[PDB]
Write a protein that binds this ligand. Structure first.
Ligand SMILES: OC[C@H]1O[C@@H](O[C@H]2[C@H](O)[C@@H](O)[C@H](O[C@H]3[C@H](O)[C@@H](O)[C@H](O[C@H]4[C@H](O)[C@@H](O)[C@H](O)O[C@@H]4CO)O[C@@H]3CO)O[C@@H]2CO)[C@H](O)[C@@H](O)[C@@H]1O
Ligand SMILES: [Cl-]
Ligand SMILES: [Cl-]
Length: 414
């Protein structure tokens, strides 16, 4: 008679934080909530195994980009009633509302839980020593490359590591997602997929998509990303920025919360980076400013034996008080627009920078096939990183890889 909820690791002690969050719900409803944490690397497989077997929790977290795929399997309970109780369409950013459903579907299948978007963390101390004005460096693509050139030339050394800092750390290992690449594709005027003629097709091989992708990967090729970074994944690069190896690195808003937590508690409060932390939005590309905007939603399996209490929990987790409290514990942003006004978010100057970048937030379409698109894109992007690791990424070779990515994506989408 326990409600069961599956979550990902959204906070340093993620189960304890989730239990603290729901204790008022448990007391008001006379029920216990049992939480299971799934690592982000394995969550998709465990959630899809529950969807196919009918054995699983009442509720699951879903990354926003997963909602279409899980909804298309016909295993999610409608939640238009819950979203109505929370304020309906009006209560959310369009970028958040669009993740409540499979695109074109009638009925919502997911409740917004938290939002996140990407921006650049930078070392305030390293840019000052390099003579870089952050407002110029993060204005434009030309600004960004000029600032990296100045950071490469800098004699600055981290006070702890006593060594120079990489201008930019970005991972070169085959990525799990396009989160890092997408702003450069978009800033150039391109897109991952495009809807035309009542079908979706790859646009990764568009002149504009190839422009942004080449710009981004050539920064590594030009000496602004150290060879060692190419051999790392996102978690390893995050550790490198925290350990004082990187002047600039792109991530979500949670690293602000982690900068106030001791290392022994899973943050980096003691590190120089934590004490010299800036944030700047992605620079304007040729065709405008964009960043990846995502987050997580909650879904109810239609095979749950506790749908009535599970919907009350969704209403609780989706509502103002729990919205504020969980974003405070995780370092994410509320999903619910009203909750953004809390002074805990507005008066935090680093998080305010994320708040202002949300105007340029861009999302993926909520497609049934999205996983398969992203998986083919990332496997080809990996091959392009391997060329960067040889100094052999040319425009010709990047186009050849993206034409192959585009053939396989169009096959999958058909
Ligand atoms: O693509 C699916 C989905 O992605 C969402 O973005 C997720 C990322 O997928 C995920 O890798 C990222 O994970 C963070 C996590 O939130 C932090 O809590 C975690 O914090 C760590 C800490 O940084 C570590 O030092 C320590 O080891 O433990 C704690 C956690 O216990 O750091 C990781 C690493 O980046 O979280 C992203 C935001 O949820 C998108 O939002 C969504 O749209 C996509 O659908
Ligand atoms: Cl990438
Ligand atoms: Cl896109």
């Amino acid at each position: 008679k326990t409600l069961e909820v599956w979550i990902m690791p959204n906070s340093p002690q993620p189960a304890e934080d989730f239990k603290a969050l729901v204790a008022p719900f448990e007391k008001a409803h006379g029920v216990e909530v049992k939480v299971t944490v799934l690592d982000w690397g394995v969550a998709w497989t465990k959630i899809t195994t529950a969807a196919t077997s009918g054995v699983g929790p009442d509720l699951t977290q879903l990354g926003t980009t997963w909602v279409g795929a899980i909804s298309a399997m016909g295993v999610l309970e409608p939640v238009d009633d819950v979203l109505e109780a929370l304020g309906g369409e009006k209560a959310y950013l369009p970028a958040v509302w669009r993740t409540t459903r499979l695109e074109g579907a009638r009925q919502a299948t997911a409740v917004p839980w938290f939002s996140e978007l990407r921006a650049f963390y930078y070392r305030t101390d390293a840019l000052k020593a390099a003579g870089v004005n952050p407002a110029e460096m993060f204005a434009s693509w030309q600004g960004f490359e000029a600032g990296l050139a100045r950071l490469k030339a800098s004699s600055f050394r981290d006070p702890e590591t006593k060594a120079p800092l990489a201008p930019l750390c970005t991972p070169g290992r085959t990525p799990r997602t396009l989160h890092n690449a997408a702003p450069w594709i978009w800033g150039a005027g391109g897109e991952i997929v495009r809807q035309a003629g009542g079908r979706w097709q790859s646009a990764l091989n568009s002149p504009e998509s190839l422009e942004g992708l080449y710009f981004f990967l050539s920064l590594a090729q030009k000496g602004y990303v150290p060879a060692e970074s190419l051999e790392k994944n996102t978690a390893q690069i995050e550790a490198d920025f925290q350990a004082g190896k990187c002047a600039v690195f792109a991530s979500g808003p949670w690293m602000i919360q982690r900068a106030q937590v001791p290392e022994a508690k899973g943050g980096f409060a003691e590190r120089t980076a934590a004490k010299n932390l800036g944030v700047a939005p992605y620079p304007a590309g040729p065709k405008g400013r964009y960043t990846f905007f995502g987050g997580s939603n909650l879904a109810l399996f239609n095979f749950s034996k506790n749908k009535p209490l599970a919907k009350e929990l969704l209403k609780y987790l989706g509502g103002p008080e729990a919205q504020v409290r969980y974003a405070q514990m995780t370092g994410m942003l509320p999903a619910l627009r009203s909750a953004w006004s809390d002074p805990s978010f507005q008066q935090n100057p680093l998080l305010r920078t994320f708040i202002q970048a949300a105007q340029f937030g861009r999302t993926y379409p909520s497609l049934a096939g999205w996983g398969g698109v992203e998986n083919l894109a990332v496997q080809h992007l990996g091959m392009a990183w391997d060329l960067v690791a040889q100094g052999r990424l040319t425009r010709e070779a990047l186009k050849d890889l993206m034409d192959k990515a585009s053939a396989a994506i169009n096959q999958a989408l058909r």
